[PDB]
Amino acid sequence: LYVEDNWNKCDMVAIFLFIVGVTCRMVPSVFEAGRTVLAIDFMVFTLRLIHIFAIHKQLGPKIIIVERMMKDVFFFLFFLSVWLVAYGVTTQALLHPDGRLEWIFRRVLYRPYLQIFGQIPLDEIDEYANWLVILLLVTFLLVTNVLLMNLLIAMFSY
Amino acid sequence: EEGRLTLAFSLHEVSRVLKDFLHDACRGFDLSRKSEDPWRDLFLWAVLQNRYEMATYFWAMGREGVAAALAACKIIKEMSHLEKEAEVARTMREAKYEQLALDLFSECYSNSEDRAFALLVRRNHSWSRTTCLHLATEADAKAFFAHDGVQAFLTKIWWGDMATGTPILRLLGAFTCPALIYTNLISFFLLTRWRKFWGAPVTVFLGNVVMYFAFLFLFSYVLLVDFRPPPQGPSGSEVTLYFWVFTLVLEEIRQGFFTNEDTRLVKKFTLYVEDNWNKCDMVAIFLFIVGVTCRMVPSVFEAGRTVLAIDFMVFTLRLIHIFAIHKQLGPKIIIVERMMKDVFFFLFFLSVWLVAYGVTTQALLHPDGRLEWIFRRVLYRPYLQIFGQIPLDEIDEYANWLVILLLVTFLLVTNVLLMNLLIAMFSYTFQVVQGNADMFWKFQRYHLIVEYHGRPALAPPFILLSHLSLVLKQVFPDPVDQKIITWETVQKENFLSTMEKRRRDSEEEVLRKTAHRVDLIAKYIGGL
Amino acid sequence: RDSEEEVLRKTAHRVDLIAKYIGGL
């Protein structure tokens, strides 16, 4: 019944991460790995702090509302991310005929954080006329991702 | 008239009206012999003429009440879609031959919950051997498929073995574990146990979805790095991806045309295309074959690359259907699909507004003969000014241009208001359409469950060998059903009796009865 | 007891009783 909680599991995984990191901290060869594990342990510790709303009448139930929404939010966000990655694959395999896996992955990540955050690199997204029509169709399709975000927030509020 | 033109009424014309209506009543109707199952005959005779009271009466003495109430729903729905005087049509359509079957099945399922599931799969004796589900799907009985009893049936046929109890975690984890491990994990010569544990629908679902992901990633990498010169063209990509997509199309056609029976080919073809997602697969295969034909033309190399790279987009957009079975997420898809029809139009007009703004700005501030320059600048401003980039070096310059830039910044808040209107109507339509979403999802789940029941366990690659085995195989009880019939009748009359008791105990009847008795006793006492 | 359904049923039954009695006469 101790483990039957969800937050007791939070504390358990937190202590596990911290002890793994403190064991890595004794290995001079894995110095950076220990630093990484402690710096994620800190994140789980500071995420533990959420329970202090439980006693506040005004704010308290908002936490459990969010927790209820989170179960569907994770799945829907995962699929939306798969859609975004598919869009990235289409763009990369069409416009730019990048053998470095680092190049492909980092460009797909940057376009998710530049084109979806307000950066249209016309120097790399607009170039002979077939590529222009392709860029047109991509800008055309982006409104579907906007609709997907609208669906997300609508179901979230419902 | 048509029958005599080919080469007053007997029963042949009647039989033909009915067979034209349903084709489930194909037997149909010697003017002397005593009729067989006459109460049905009277049900029909009184439901064709749209007579209600005599119809439900004649029904309340017949054998079945989820076979016949659904056939009568279909018949009156068709006739109401065939009426001329719209008053008669609106009268017919408001007859409710559906609530009767839904009610009889509710009361027939609460009482046993395991005989009901022999009622559905049953081969009805009086209506020429067609299951209650056939009749229920012809009538488009959305209000019947949404019935909790039928939903539990669809579940127990979805899983198949250890039906209600198989958590998704242990289910997915059972991938590699052997027979006895499954026995210790999920309930259910041991080769037959492995068959009964990996022939069920849900295992076919997961197997085919895993093979689908593997197909998409193989196709991605072979569209990315397997474009060797047109001398070889698609070298490693072509063989694999072509084999896969070919067997996939073969699976689609087979499952489309070789599943139910050997009915009319044009009808099956038209109802295959009558979907929206069958059209998705059709246009996908068309795009892929166009691209693979372009891939043989060394002059249009880039065009083939483009067509394949759009084909990939339509393939990966096909993946959306796998939410249909998830209760929590399922109906969100159809909510979005409902909103999309208005979303497309409203977004198109908003885009026209944005382009008009771009034209005003370009024709005012910058007096660009290159069409490329104009179009690309209008596109960039839609992705820079509406995304957070105000180029003051090109939007601010002598004072008239300054006032113009001021007015443009002033007007931008109207586009902000337009976006607010968009999201507001978007959120409203969701609550507006949240009603029928559950019923539509239930219908979709039925179609999906029977679909995945139909197919074998092999994947699209192994679907070749599966269909090979299929073509190879193509190359080479009265007492208990009588018991179920009697039980059906007993439950029908139970339902009728309790409905009549509840109608008697209605307080309107009580008040009218006591008022009439008060009037009688008052007249009597006034007589004295 | 004060439920109006019980009140209505009680008064209807009493009306039926008195009606049967007065019809007997």
UniProtKB/TrEMBL annotation, chain A:
It is found in: Membrane. It comes from the Eukaryota. The chain crosses the membrane at residues 10-31, 74-95, 128-148. Residues 1-158 form the Ion transport domain. This is Transient receptor potential cation channel subfamily M member 5. The lineage of its organism: Eukaryota, Metazoa, Chordata, Craniata, Vertebrata. The chain holds residues 798 to 977 of 1156 of the full protein.
From TrEMBL, chain B:
It comes from the Eukaryota. Residues 213-434 form the Ion transport domain. Keywords: Ion channel, Ion transport, Membrane, Receptor, Transmembrane, Transmembrane helix, Transport. The chain crosses the membrane at residues 197-221, 280-301, 344-365, 398-418. The keyword Plastid does not apply. Its main location: membrane. One of its GO terms (biological process) is monoatomic cation transmembrane transport. The keyword Protein biosynthesis does not apply. One of its GO terms (molecular function) is monoatomic ion channel activity. GO terms for cellular component: membrane. It is found in: Membrane. This is Transient receptor potential cation channel subfamily M member 5. It comes from Rattus norvegicus (Rat). The gene is Trpm5.
